[PDB]
Write a protein that binds this ligand. Structure first.
Ligand SMILES: O=C1C=CN([C@@H]2O[C@H](COP(=O)(O)OP(=O)(O)OP(=O)(O)O)C[C@H]2O)C(O)N1
Ligand SMILES: [Mg+2]
Ligand SMILES: [Mn+2]
Ligand SMILES: [Mn+2]
Length: 328
DNA sequence: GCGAGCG
DNA sequence: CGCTCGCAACGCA
DNA sequence: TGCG
């Protein structure tokens, strides 16, 4: 049929192909229209607050998740008037205009473009040199899974954050692991925030060394949860809160309370189930913006590691370097 | 999914 | 016109 | 010249 128009909180968004299948395993429950309806359910409320003012990359499947994948950082030169952008700087020093999430219409436009997963930077525009978010990525290695991740998050990481006077917010990744966010004052750069995250990861590890590893080299990790400290680098992003994932059942990265995480199963949260699960339930991340935390406690961990003779760790193998940057 | 470049 | 082609920043095997 |  011809295209239709969605009125998204006052902004008109062109919408096509509602019945195109994106998730074959789900049949009629895996159409592009189902995906747009899910995003309409979350983009005005809890998802928008967590994405607000952030530049994002888009992981697009215009022909569904078994077709071509388009990972897109730059915004197309020609695009609707209602989309806003902001300037990000990549590890090489190149800059680009990235889509900035300012209104539910930009999430719905992304969905119309086939975006399954949104990937926000850890900064807010326009101060895109200073993260306001430290990310902890609990990544089960072969032989481990979500049970290990939720156990380590609840029993090791959360009590450590309590001891440090820090508050963190957990979500399922929608894969096998767990993400934990700390809102921080935007007072430190990517290098400093990443060092803080390395010191946090090393402290989690030394509290549960049989369950946790920070080893960059895979042959040393074993059947343990890896804390991927490099996710705090520049141009390293995360699937956003409330993003659908490229899994056969369209799982969703789901914010939880710490109490819920203890017994959670990530397959419970999909683009088909999440809206009904939010109804009547307090947003567990309602307070994330209420306290702009200092990195101070984690930078103390950094200095203590330096006294142990432990400094920086390798960046990812593909990681660029800026002409003036320090040892990668 | 869509615009730019081609023939 | 219809049709194909980018859409990732990057170091490496 | 691809891999991911
Ligand atoms: O080259 C890349 C490739 C992925 N990136 C981002 O990082 C995450 C990678 O997530 P990952 O930990 O590898 O796996 P998950 O999707 O989080 O599921 P999991 O819990 O099973 O690990 C996805 C993107 O937002 C990135 O920033 N740069
Ligand atoms: Mg917007
Ligand atoms: Mn992960
Ligand atoms: Mn990871």
């Amino acid at each position: 049929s011809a295209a239709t128009e969605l009125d998204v909180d006052g902004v008109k968004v062109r919408f096509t192909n509602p019945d195109k299948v994106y998730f074959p395993k789900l049949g009629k429950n895996g159409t592009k229209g189902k995906l747009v309806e899910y995003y309409l359910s979350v983009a005005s409320g809890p998802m928008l607050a967590l994405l607000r003012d952030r530049p994002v990359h888009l992981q697009r499947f215009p022909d569904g998740i078994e077709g071509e994948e388009i990972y897109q950082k730059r915004v197309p030169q020609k695009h609707p008037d209602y989309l806003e952008t902001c300037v990000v700087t990549f590890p090489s020093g190149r800059t680009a205009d990235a889509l900035k999430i300012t209104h539910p219409s930009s999430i719905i436009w992304a969905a119309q473009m086939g975006t399954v997963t949104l990937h926000p930077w850890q900064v807010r525009c326009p101060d895109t040199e200073h993260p306001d978010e430290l990310r902890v990525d609990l990544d089960p290695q072969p032989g481990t899974g979500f049970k290990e991740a939720r156990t380590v998050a609840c029993d090791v990481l959360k009590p450590l954050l309590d001891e440090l006077g820090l508050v963190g917010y957990p979500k399922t990744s929608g894969g096998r692991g767990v993400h934990v966010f700390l809102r921080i004052k935007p007072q430190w750069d990517f290098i400093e925030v990443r060092r803080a995250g390395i010191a946090l990861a090393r402290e989690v590890e030394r509290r549960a060394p049989d369950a946790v590893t920070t080893s960059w080299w895979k042959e040393e990790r074993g059947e343990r949860l890896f804390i991927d400290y490099n996710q705090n680098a520049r141009d390293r992003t995360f699937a956003s809160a409330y993003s659908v994932r490229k899994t056969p059942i369209a799982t969703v990265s789901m914010p939880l309370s710490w109490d819920e995480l203890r017994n959670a199963d990530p397959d419970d949260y999909t683009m088909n189930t999440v809206p009904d699960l939010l109804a009547g339930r307090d947003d567990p991340w309602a307070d994330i913006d209420s306290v702009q935390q200092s990195l101070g406690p984690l930078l103390d961990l950094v200095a203590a590691d330096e006294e142990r003779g432990l400094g920086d760790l390798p960046y990812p193998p593909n990681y660029p370097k800026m002409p003036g940057e320090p040892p990668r």
